[PDB]
Amino acid sequence: QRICEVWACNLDEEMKKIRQVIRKYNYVAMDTEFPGVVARPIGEFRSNADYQYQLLRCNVDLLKIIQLGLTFMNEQGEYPPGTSTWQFNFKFNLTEDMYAQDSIELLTTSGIQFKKHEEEGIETQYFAELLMTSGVVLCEGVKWLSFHSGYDFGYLIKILTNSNLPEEELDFFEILRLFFPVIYDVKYLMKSCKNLKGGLQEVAEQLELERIGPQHQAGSDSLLTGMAFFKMREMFFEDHIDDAKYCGHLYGLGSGSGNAYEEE
Amino acid sequence: HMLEENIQEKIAFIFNNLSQSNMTQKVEELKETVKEEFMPWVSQYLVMKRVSIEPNFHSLYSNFLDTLKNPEFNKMVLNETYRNIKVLLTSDKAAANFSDRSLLKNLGHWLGMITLAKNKPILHTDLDVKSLLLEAYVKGQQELLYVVPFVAKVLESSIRSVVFRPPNPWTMAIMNVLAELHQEHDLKLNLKFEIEVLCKNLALDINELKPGNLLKDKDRLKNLDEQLS
Amino acid sequence: AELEISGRVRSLSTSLWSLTHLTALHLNDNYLSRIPPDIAKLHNLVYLDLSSNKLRSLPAELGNMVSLRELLLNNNLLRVLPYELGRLFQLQTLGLKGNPLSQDILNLYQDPDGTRKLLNFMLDNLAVKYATRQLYGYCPSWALNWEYRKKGIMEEIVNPLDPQWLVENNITGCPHPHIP
């Protein structure tokens, strides 16, 4: 029961629970699955300071999110009883939507039932209508955890605004702090931890965590991200993180100055 | 009546005379006359005795909270607003209760300014707007005249917030419910007017909206969580 | 002004389609089946590398991005081309190699200046003094012939200019064969 898979059917049912776990479990871990990147931007060059951002915007306005994984914990790294993770699965049609070949083959190998997604997936904008008035976003007190997640939050903003991402890197962080006042990107906090480097799974193997659930899927990646966060905090940061030094610095992005895309 | 007369008029004098320039003064005047435990009753005083009747000074009553910079108090204010609105929504309604409806409209406006305008949501555990609209539809024209001008005053604040500004999916969802309402033939004329005015207030075309078919569900309308009496 | 989408794209979405500021767009090395007619939005499009695709039939609306000056269509599945394409007169390079076109089209394209000879033929066959092709594009060759516009000149000699006709179509290009 540890990870509750959520479809267009049982979305509201589990939303009812989530509006009650967020009262007792305010720390939220997240990772996203999406059709990769399909386009390089434009007339910008790899020399512009904010190129990583425009590269993010190009492929986020263009593509749709596939999976969202949310794990709920508290200040001391404990999970709520029963389901601690929800794996939201969105509506994605292969016949009609874009993607990179390799990313879809990888997601299929991991265990994505693209046909079941096609018939029974959640629509993104109604999930936005719900997550809005839930307390998970926009409300002070919640602290978001993530990993190498410029694109993850890019898609979250794309969905919550029902609009294309703003044209400059500055406005994006503006609206982003509004929806997510507190963010800890583990990939950026690692920039102060000697002898930690690598993707999510490599770091997970270094920290002696046990991966619960299917690899490369959003829910299990988020649960493992939370394990990594609370295992690393007690280890390197002495069980506390300076807000001024690490809050909101998305890895690869200009905040906290090196690619922003969660490369394999 | 909620406080000793000596404790009542004291917090009354703070809010009696208020303006832009004397803002900082009256804030400090509140902070060193009023014990930090009467803050629930100063919250009750502001919501019940001041905000509920005086929409004009709402702006000022916001700046004060912005000047006071006290979060626990803002939370008490939010809860008091929610409670008063709950009282009006479950009261015995009548075609003569204009006082109660006017109070509800102003309380709505206030709620829109303290939540949406501040980039803060109206929690589904605190209040369900869409469900309130659908329930008002099934319960008759009276509940509609109670609810619609109230939801209008909450959504008018969505424009000054970069978040809930159009095309925000939740804002647009409530707008789609209101547009699905605007198309009925027997909807009261002033409510159609109220809706059109809201559309103008949020810089939207009432025709480019995307009405749903929520009102023909019948089955779903029979299974709404009752927020009204 | 120049986008290049890679990674074997099956089908394109409609957010692309919304970035008018683009003066060029590349879709090379993808698995595109066709091009949504909605490409017309991107009016600033001057260069379109639709090569290395699997396009069986080009959209007819394609031939309205007049600013488009270089169009790459090699390595595909096009059996013929939309005659409407002949409209695009500012086109400077028409790449058609590797397509199973008919012999008559291939003969016109293999000539010296075969790009212009093919576009002039299409425009002359599109369904409806000095003054030459090279300056007046909009009038097809059969219409710039002095005999055709003398006919309409004489009719006006014997004889409400609503711009409505030219909004979507924009038949803005003048002596369009009605006009002398």
XYZ file of C-alpha atoms in Angstrom:
673
model
C 0.000 0.000 0.000
C 3.107 2.167 0.364
C 2.620 3.857 -3.032
C -0.937 4.654 -4.142
C -1.328 4.786 -7.912
C -3.810 7.485 -8.908
C -5.872 7.683 -12.106
C -8.761 9.784 -13.391
C -10.964 7.440 -11.341
C -9.532 7.496 -7.808
C -8.057 11.016 -8.019
C -10.650 12.746 -5.824
C -10.725 9.886 -3.301
C -7.002 10.150 -2.589
C -7.130 13.958 -2.724
C -9.466 13.702 0.264
C -6.704 11.882 2.173
C -3.924 14.196 0.981
C -5.762 17.253 2.292
C -5.464 15.570 5.723
C -1.904 14.237 5.593
C -0.592 17.692 4.645
C -1.827 18.863 8.059
C 0.448 16.372 9.841
C 3.166 15.820 7.189
C 4.411 19.036 5.579
C 7.599 17.870 3.825
C 6.974 16.851 0.210
C 9.380 14.965 -2.086
C 8.902 14.934 -5.839
C 10.217 13.761 -9.188
C 8.615 13.829 -12.626
C 8.606 11.668 -15.734
C 8.177 13.362 -19.104
C 9.000 12.689 -22.783
C 12.517 14.086 -22.414
C 13.730 16.979 -24.557
C 13.027 17.349 -28.261
C 14.319 20.779 -29.277
C 17.255 23.077 -28.829
C 16.281 26.739 -28.509
C 17.132 29.544 -30.704
C 19.378 32.497 -31.524
C 20.331 32.186 -27.943
C 23.691 30.470 -27.816
C 25.382 28.231 -25.268
C 27.198 31.378 -24.021
C 24.187 33.289 -22.647
C 24.087 33.105 -18.853
C 20.453 31.932 -18.794
C 20.624 29.414 -21.655
C 19.726 26.467 -19.428
C 16.449 28.233 -18.611
C 15.393 28.832 -22.211
C 16.335 25.237 -23.012
C 13.954 24.258 -20.201
C 11.137 26.526 -21.426
C 11.372 25.301 -25.026
C 10.763 21.650 -24.130
C 8.311 22.271 -21.274
C 5.890 24.503 -23.194
C 6.106 21.949 -26.002
C 5.608 18.643 -24.160
C 3.206 17.262 -21.548
C 3.927 15.686 -18.164
C 3.612 11.900 -17.872
C 3.990 11.066 -14.174
C 4.084 12.932 -10.872
C 5.321 11.338 -7.670
C 4.661 12.844 -4.242
C 5.981 11.539 -0.918
C 4.811 13.065 2.369
C 6.988 13.226 5.491
C 7.552 15.431 8.542
C 10.349 17.302 10.318
C 12.055 14.156 11.650
C 11.756 12.033 8.501
C 8.686 9.934 9.324
C 5.926 8.785 7.003
C 2.153 8.909 7.522
C 0.478 5.590 8.305
C -0.497 3.639 5.218
C 0.131 5.318 1.876
C 3.042 7.737 2.138
C 3.402 8.208 -1.636
C 1.001 8.984 -4.471
C 1.924 8.297 -8.105
C -0.316 10.498 -10.244
C -0.522 9.341 -13.865
C -1.601 11.772 -16.578
C -3.333 11.512 -19.948
C -0.756 11.023 -22.726
C -1.486 9.899 -26.295
C 1.397 8.566 -28.375
C -0.506 8.925 -31.663
C -0.984 12.662 -31.021
C 1.760 13.948 -28.689
C 5.488 14.497 -29.145
C 8.388 12.736 -27.442
C 11.941 11.448 -27.812
C 12.280 7.828 -28.993
C 14.764 6.832 -26.328
C 12.813 8.261 -23.403
C 9.661 6.348 -24.332
C 11.569 3.095 -24.793
C 13.141 3.625 -21.362
C 9.828 4.442 -19.665
C 8.269 1.366 -21.272
C 11.100 -0.820 -19.983
C 10.583 0.683 -16.521
C 6.889 -0.200 -16.539
C 4.665 2.539 -17.958
C 1.385 1.205 -19.381
C 1.019 3.798 -22.120
C -2.264 2.262 -23.333
C -3.824 2.450 -19.867
C -2.537 6.031 -19.677
C -4.218 6.749 -23.015
C -7.619 5.487 -21.893
C -7.781 6.333 -18.161
C -5.254 9.110 -17.545
C -5.772 12.187 -15.408
C -6.194 15.493 -17.200
C -3.588 17.974 -16.008
C -5.724 21.094 -15.683
C -8.311 19.549 -13.356
C -5.486 18.200 -11.205
C -4.390 21.851 -11.094
C -7.885 22.991 -10.073
C -7.630 20.509 -7.200
C -4.004 20.945 -6.085
C -4.588 24.714 -5.994
C -6.947 24.733 -2.997
C -5.268 21.779 -1.284
C -2.603 23.367 0.911
C 0.194 21.536 -0.895
C 0.989 24.668 -2.916
C 0.889 28.411 -2.256
C 0.672 27.858 1.519
C 3.513 28.823 3.852
C 5.074 26.099 5.987
C 5.401 23.384 3.357
C 8.959 22.550 2.293
C 9.493 20.949 -1.113
C 12.328 18.494 -1.779
C 13.566 17.650 -5.252
C 16.465 16.288 -7.319
C 18.005 17.988 -10.365
C 14.547 19.262 -11.002
C 14.522 22.343 -13.209
C 12.226 20.510 -15.598
C 10.147 18.939 -12.818
C 9.150 22.342 -11.445
C 8.935 23.662 -15.012
C 6.128 21.215 -15.720
C 4.513 21.914 -12.342
C 4.386 25.620 -13.219
C 3.177 24.874 -16.760
C 0.275 22.930 -15.292
C -0.595 25.268 -12.412
C -0.576 28.423 -14.556
C -2.405 26.921 -17.570
C 0.006 29.011 -19.647
C 3.400 28.865 -21.303
C 6.367 29.617 -19.064
C 7.375 33.306 -18.894
C 9.907 34.520 -21.423
C 12.764 35.354 -19.007
C 14.445 33.384 -16.221
C 13.662 36.060 -13.618
C 9.854 35.988 -13.791
C 9.916 32.181 -13.652
C 11.642 32.132 -10.269
C 9.264 34.885 -9.128
C 6.070 32.924 -9.764
C 7.910 29.791 -8.639
C 8.690 31.029 -5.125
C 5.017 32.054 -5.004
C 3.806 28.497 -5.646
C 6.728 26.881 -3.761
C 8.141 29.196 -1.072
C 10.669 26.603 0.145
C 12.614 24.293 -2.184
C 15.646 22.097 -1.475
C 17.223 20.615 -4.599
C 19.347 17.719 -3.335
C 21.478 18.028 -6.471
C 22.384 21.585 -5.449
C 22.965 20.799 -1.770
C 25.437 18.167 -2.980
C 27.589 21.125 -4.194
C 28.716 21.424 -0.547
C 29.126 17.702 0.283
C 32.583 16.322 -0.469
C 32.471 12.864 -2.100
C 28.881 12.942 -3.358
C 28.146 13.018 -7.081
C 26.000 11.222 -9.629
C 22.425 10.669 -10.656
C 19.621 9.845 -8.262
C 20.301 6.093 -8.277
C 24.078 6.406 -7.860
C 23.592 8.697 -4.855
C 20.974 6.288 -3.514
C 23.514 3.465 -3.677
C 26.123 5.622 -1.940
C 23.755 6.523 0.929
C 22.722 2.886 1.683
C 19.073 3.623 0.991
C 16.646 0.930 -0.111
C 14.580 1.781 -3.165
C 10.905 0.979 -2.592
C 8.947 0.572 -5.807
C 9.734 0.514 -9.531
C 12.846 2.343 -10.695
C 12.601 5.401 -12.968
C 8.943 5.979 -12.033
C 7.907 9.210 -10.370
C 6.511 7.847 -7.106
C 9.479 5.627 -6.312
C 11.953 8.328 -7.370
C 10.210 10.752 -4.997
C 10.222 8.302 -2.082
C 13.910 7.598 -2.689
C 14.512 11.346 -2.937
C 12.990 11.769 0.511
C 15.102 8.956 1.935
C 18.165 10.630 0.411
C 17.222 14.017 1.845
C 16.678 12.853 5.415
C 19.700 10.537 5.287
C 21.985 13.279 3.952
C 20.741 16.003 6.301
C 21.701 14.077 9.448
C 25.011 13.171 7.783
C 26.509 16.261 6.106
C 24.353 19.162 7.318
C 24.118 18.098 10.997
C 20.310 17.759 10.782
C 19.591 21.305 9.586
C 19.828 23.305 6.368
C 20.538 27.023 6.147
C 17.646 28.591 4.244
C 19.737 31.531 3.022
C 22.414 29.184 1.665
C 20.356 26.463 -0.057
C 16.631 27.336 -0.280
C 15.336 27.571 -3.837
C 18.591 27.111 -5.779
C 17.539 24.862 -8.650
C 20.523 22.939 -9.979
C 21.730 24.046 -13.397
C 19.648 27.228 -13.167
C 21.028 30.713 -12.518
C 19.785 30.760 -8.904
C 22.702 29.890 -6.635
C 25.537 29.998 -9.182
C 26.051 22.555 -14.919
C 22.989 21.458 -16.892
C 19.396 21.724 -15.668
C 18.021 18.610 -17.398
C 17.895 15.390 -15.354
C 20.241 13.529 -17.680
C 20.639 9.771 -17.216
C -20.921 42.940 24.018
C -17.994 40.666 23.157
C -15.680 42.599 25.510
C -15.891 44.820 28.569
C -17.055 48.260 27.480
C -13.712 49.663 28.673
C -11.980 46.965 26.605
C -14.528 47.360 23.776
C -14.297 51.046 22.908
C -10.506 50.889 23.307
C -9.986 48.677 20.273
C -12.906 50.581 18.742
C -10.878 53.818 18.780
C -8.033 52.122 16.896
C -10.244 51.330 13.900
C -12.608 54.309 14.229
C -10.084 56.730 12.733
C -7.771 55.170 10.148
C -6.052 56.395 6.979
C -2.905 55.990 4.883
C -0.665 58.345 6.855
C -1.729 57.360 10.386
C -1.334 53.671 9.476
C 1.952 53.025 11.307
C 0.695 55.010 14.307
C -2.568 53.096 14.790
C -0.634 49.840 14.319
C 1.676 50.718 17.180
C -1.300 52.046 19.116
C -2.818 48.604 18.778
C 0.397 46.845 19.783
C 0.907 48.537 23.149
C -2.794 49.086 24.430
C -4.267 45.713 23.541
C -2.920 42.700 25.353
C -1.748 39.952 23.047
C -4.548 37.728 24.401
C -7.427 40.014 23.357
C -6.300 39.448 19.762
C -9.073 36.863 19.146
C -11.614 39.472 20.240
C -9.966 42.269 18.254
C -10.149 39.835 15.325
C -13.839 39.263 16.050
C -14.329 43.031 16.350
C -12.637 43.750 13.012
C -14.447 40.993 11.106
C -17.925 41.249 12.647
C -18.255 44.904 13.648
C -16.154 46.551 10.935
C -15.406 44.525 7.792
C -18.894 43.034 7.518
C -20.607 46.408 7.006
C -17.903 48.669 5.543
C -16.589 47.424 2.185
C -15.176 50.861 1.376
C -12.451 50.767 4.035
C -11.579 47.142 3.176
C -8.452 48.443 1.426
C -7.331 50.182 4.617
C -8.117 47.114 6.724
C -5.758 45.198 4.437
C -2.862 47.666 4.718
C -3.160 47.451 8.508
C -2.649 43.681 8.383
C 0.209 44.290 5.948
C 1.606 46.908 8.327
C 1.079 44.808 11.465
C 3.136 41.904 10.052
C 1.592 39.468 12.555
C 0.777 36.022 11.098
C -1.086 34.330 13.960
C -3.474 37.283 13.941
C -4.012 37.049 10.175
C -4.867 33.369 10.684
C -7.378 34.180 13.433
C -8.909 36.739 11.049
C -9.185 34.135 8.286
C -10.897 31.692 10.647
C -13.332 34.336 11.918
C -14.272 35.269 8.348
C -14.839 31.592 7.523
C -17.011 31.138 10.621
C -19.195 34.190 9.956
C -19.704 33.106 6.351
C -20.654 29.593 7.519
C -23.212 31.231 9.805
C -24.781 33.186 6.954
C -24.846 30.222 4.546
C -26.780 27.962 6.954
C -29.105 30.643 8.335
C -32.849 30.627 7.732
C -32.997 32.566 4.474
C -35.906 34.706 3.299
C -36.884 37.113 0.535
C -36.611 39.891 3.154
C -33.170 39.124 4.634
C -31.267 41.813 2.726
C -29.036 42.528 5.735
C -27.708 38.965 5.817
C -27.004 38.900 2.061
C -25.203 42.231 2.166
C -23.080 40.993 5.068
C -22.315 37.860 3.043
C -21.285 39.869 -0.028
C -18.888 42.007 1.998
C -17.473 38.969 3.818
C -16.878 37.361 0.434
C -15.085 40.424 -0.911
C -12.917 40.428 2.222
C -12.105 36.716 1.882
C -11.072 37.305 -1.715
C -8.724 40.066 -0.610
C -7.072 38.139 2.242
C -6.602 34.888 0.296
C -6.498 35.306 -3.470
C -5.056 38.828 -3.585
C -2.275 37.691 -1.231
C -1.482 34.681 -3.478
C -3.097 32.235 -1.047
C -5.779 29.639 -1.868
C -9.245 29.115 -0.419
C -8.715 25.624 0.971
C -11.077 22.828 -0.045
C -11.293 21.888 3.639
C -12.261 25.488 4.455
C -14.701 26.121 1.590
C -15.683 24.505 -1.744
C -16.722 27.233 -4.176
C -17.727 25.086 -7.160
C -19.763 22.759 -4.949
C -21.386 25.772 -3.279
C -22.522 27.051 -6.684
C -23.945 23.687 -7.754
C -25.702 23.251 -4.396
C -27.213 26.732 -4.688
C -28.519 25.782 -8.128
C -30.211 22.632 -6.872
C -31.658 24.398 -3.815
C -33.463 27.140 -5.768
C -33.207 30.744 -6.894
C -33.010 31.988 -3.292
C -29.753 30.161 -2.596
C -28.498 31.426 -5.970
C -29.146 35.050 -5.016
C -27.363 34.320 -1.732
C -24.336 32.657 -3.340
C -23.657 34.235 -6.754
C -23.016 37.883 -5.699
C -20.767 36.444 -2.955
C -18.647 34.350 -5.312
C -18.468 37.389 -7.595
C -16.937 39.446 -4.794
C -14.398 36.748 -3.978
C -13.347 36.311 -7.614
C -13.027 40.049 -8.300
C -9.761 39.875 -6.330
C -8.268 37.261 -8.673
C -7.097 39.942 -11.111
C -4.619 41.672 -8.764
C -2.827 38.374 -8.017
C -0.415 37.067 -10.646
C -1.410 33.585 -9.458
C -5.207 33.490 -9.649
C -5.199 35.965 -12.539
C -6.720 34.486 -15.714
C -6.141 31.962 -17.073
C -5.684 30.278 -13.690
C -7.265 26.795 -13.940
C -9.140 26.996 -10.614
C -10.299 30.564 -11.270
C -11.344 29.615 -14.792
C -13.131 26.520 -13.432
C -15.309 28.611 -11.131
C -15.804 31.001 -14.057
C -16.942 28.091 -16.236
C -19.496 27.094 -13.610
C -20.735 30.695 -13.528
C -20.903 30.769 -17.337
C -22.847 27.500 -17.421
C -25.198 29.289 -15.025
C -25.425 32.462 -17.151
C -26.978 30.474 -20.028
C -30.128 29.297 -18.204
C -33.320 30.984 -19.356
C -34.913 31.314 -15.895
C -31.862 32.665 -14.061
C -32.723 35.952 -12.392
C -31.713 38.974 -14.442
C -29.570 40.701 -11.818
C -27.473 37.547 -11.420
C -26.757 37.419 -15.154
C -25.770 41.075 -14.756
C -23.565 40.204 -11.761
C -21.813 37.505 -13.797
C -21.237 39.761 -16.814
C -19.798 42.422 -14.499
C -17.424 39.865 -12.993
C -16.311 38.874 -16.502
C -15.524 42.506 -17.233
C -13.764 42.918 -13.873
C -11.392 40.048 -14.710
C -10.756 41.167 -18.326
C -12.547 38.203 -19.872
C -15.069 37.632 -22.640
C -18.166 35.876 -21.297
C -18.554 34.223 -24.719
C -15.000 32.856 -24.994
C -15.566 30.975 -21.725
C -16.023 27.186 -21.910
C -19.236 26.190 -20.096
C -19.492 22.622 -18.866
C -22.420 20.257 -18.494
C -22.319 20.053 -14.715
C -25.928 21.214 -14.287
C -27.362 18.323 -16.339
C -25.560 15.644 -14.313
C -28.592 15.243 -11.989
C -26.965 12.243 -10.308
C -23.934 14.285 -9.203
C -26.170 17.135 -8.025
C -27.928 14.658 -5.728
C -24.599 13.764 -4.059
C -23.161 17.158 -3.143
C -21.760 17.785 0.333
C -24.272 20.254 1.759
C -22.676 23.577 2.697
C -26.095 25.273 2.857
C -29.050 24.709 5.160
C 14.323 33.032 -34.876
C 15.579 29.434 -35.686
C 14.247 26.242 -34.042
C 15.597 22.714 -34.659
C 13.543 19.943 -33.029
C 15.354 16.592 -32.916
C 14.864 13.153 -31.420
C 12.504 11.378 -33.851
C 9.224 13.295 -33.472
C 6.248 11.252 -34.607
C 3.647 14.050 -34.479
C 3.880 17.780 -33.703
C 1.774 19.676 -31.156
C 0.086 23.077 -31.381
C 2.291 25.095 -29.020
C 4.872 25.303 -31.851
C 2.401 26.705 -34.027
C 2.149 29.609 -31.520
C 5.653 31.164 -31.525
C 5.253 33.682 -34.339
C 8.611 35.344 -33.556
C 10.296 32.408 -35.313
C 11.887 33.390 -38.612
C 13.116 29.825 -39.235
C 12.227 26.292 -38.137
C 13.993 22.956 -38.677
C 12.348 19.543 -38.324
C 15.097 17.342 -39.757
C 15.731 13.751 -38.623
C 12.293 12.996 -37.184
C 9.433 10.550 -37.738
C 6.872 13.104 -38.889
C 3.916 11.672 -40.812
C 2.525 15.038 -41.987
C 2.616 18.744 -41.147
C -0.507 20.254 -39.533
C -1.923 23.012 -41.763
C -1.631 25.241 -38.664
C 1.993 26.004 -39.675
C 0.675 29.169 -41.346
C 0.642 31.012 -37.988
C 4.449 31.276 -38.046
C 4.441 33.969 -40.727
C 8.053 34.988 -40.042
C 9.248 31.517 -41.148
C 11.936 32.010 -43.760
C 13.662 28.625 -43.505
C 12.081 25.207 -43.048
C 14.287 22.086 -42.988
C 11.562 19.462 -43.380
C 14.161 17.097 -44.795
C 14.909 13.584 -43.496
C 11.236 12.926 -42.723
C 8.483 10.548 -43.898
C 6.017 13.092 -45.270
C 3.684 11.398 -47.741
C 1.779 14.587 -48.645
C 2.528 18.212 -47.809
C -0.211 20.467 -46.406
C -1.761 22.772 -48.982
C -1.626 25.692 -46.536
C 2.195 25.476 -46.622
C 2.235 27.660 -49.739
C 1.208 30.785 -47.843
C 4.326 31.575 -45.759
C 5.480 34.072 -48.375
C 8.470 35.139 -46.268
C 9.707 31.531 -46.492
C 12.765 31.678 -48.725
C 14.453 28.328 -48.273
C 12.555 25.049 -47.974
C 14.200 21.636 -47.651
C 12.031 18.651 -48.601
C 14.539 15.913 -49.477
C 14.598 12.383 -48.021
C 10.837 11.916 -47.823
C 7.762 10.223 -49.302
C 6.175 13.004 -51.380
C 4.635 11.591 -54.545
C 3.589 15.035 -55.900
C 3.432 18.574 -54.482
C 0.511 20.901 -53.713
C 0.154 23.306 -56.625
C -0.570 26.075 -54.106
C 3.163 26.010 -53.260
C 3.840 27.939 -56.481
C 2.549 31.024 -54.678
C 5.781 31.217 -52.649
C 7.841 33.356 -55.035
C 10.500 34.559 -52.588
C 11.638 30.917 -52.328
C 15.333 30.741 -53.220
C 16.121 27.023 -52.817
C 13.678 24.168 -53.481
C 15.121 20.807 -52.489
C 13.227 17.933 -54.084
C 15.906 15.262 -54.597
C 15.002 11.734 -53.533
C 11.235 11.915 -54.079
C 9.162 9.692 -56.411
C 7.745 12.623 -58.366
C 6.387 12.234 -61.865
C 8.725 12.637 -64.816
C 7.129 15.885 -66.033
C 7.750 17.588 -62.684
C 11.301 16.212 -62.578
C 11.950 17.507 -66.113
C 10.917 21.062 -65.166
C 13.044 20.931 -61.994
C 16.207 19.553 -63.656
C 16.394 22.499 -66.087
C 18.716 25.437 -65.450
C 16.726 27.593 -63.013
C 14.415 24.614 -62.484
C 13.151 25.974 -59.171
C 11.655 29.074 -60.787
C 10.465 27.148 -63.860
C 8.571 24.712 -61.631
C 6.988 27.438 -59.475
C 5.908 29.439 -62.543
C 4.319 26.326 -64.065
C 2.389 25.610 -60.852
C 1.150 29.189 -60.532
C 0.130 29.255 -64.207
C -1.846 26.060 -63.594
C -3.268 27.029 -60.190
C -7.063 27.011 -60.104
C -8.811 30.401 -60.236
C 4.224 46.741 -71.461
C 7.064 45.545 -69.227
C 5.758 43.819 -66.058
C 7.796 40.613 -65.712
C 7.806 37.596 -63.373
C 11.051 38.586 -61.690
C 9.422 41.739 -60.226
C 5.683 40.868 -60.303
C 5.257 37.448 -58.661
C 1.600 37.388 -57.605
C 0.347 37.631 -61.212
C 0.891 34.180 -62.783
C 2.765 34.085 -66.082
C -0.380 33.537 -68.173
C -1.904 36.554 -66.389
C 1.075 38.900 -66.971
C 0.805 38.211 -70.704
C -0.268 41.529 -72.183
C -3.298 39.988 -73.927
C -4.949 38.840 -70.674
C -4.911 42.189 -68.866
C -5.832 44.088 -72.048
C -9.130 42.215 -71.870
C -9.826 43.522 -68.358
C -8.439 46.968 -69.231
C -11.034 47.334 -71.993
C -13.876 46.239 -69.698
C -13.024 48.926 -67.117
C -12.826 51.514 -69.915
C -16.552 50.999 -70.598
C -17.516 50.679 -66.899
C -16.871 49.821 -53.722
C -13.455 48.280 -52.970
C -14.217 45.998 -50.034
C -10.969 44.574 -48.572
C -13.017 41.673 -47.129
C -11.967 39.365 -49.994
C -8.350 39.744 -48.842
C -8.162 39.029 -45.073
C -7.631 35.297 -44.688
C -6.771 34.577 -48.266
C -5.012 37.933 -48.508
C -5.098 38.129 -52.279
C -3.231 41.366 -51.572
C -0.744 40.843 -54.408
C -1.950 43.128 -57.178
C -2.956 42.716 -60.709
C -4.290 39.274 -59.542
C -5.750 38.118 -62.842
C -9.086 39.928 -62.389
C -7.213 43.222 -61.878
C -5.457 44.389 -65.100
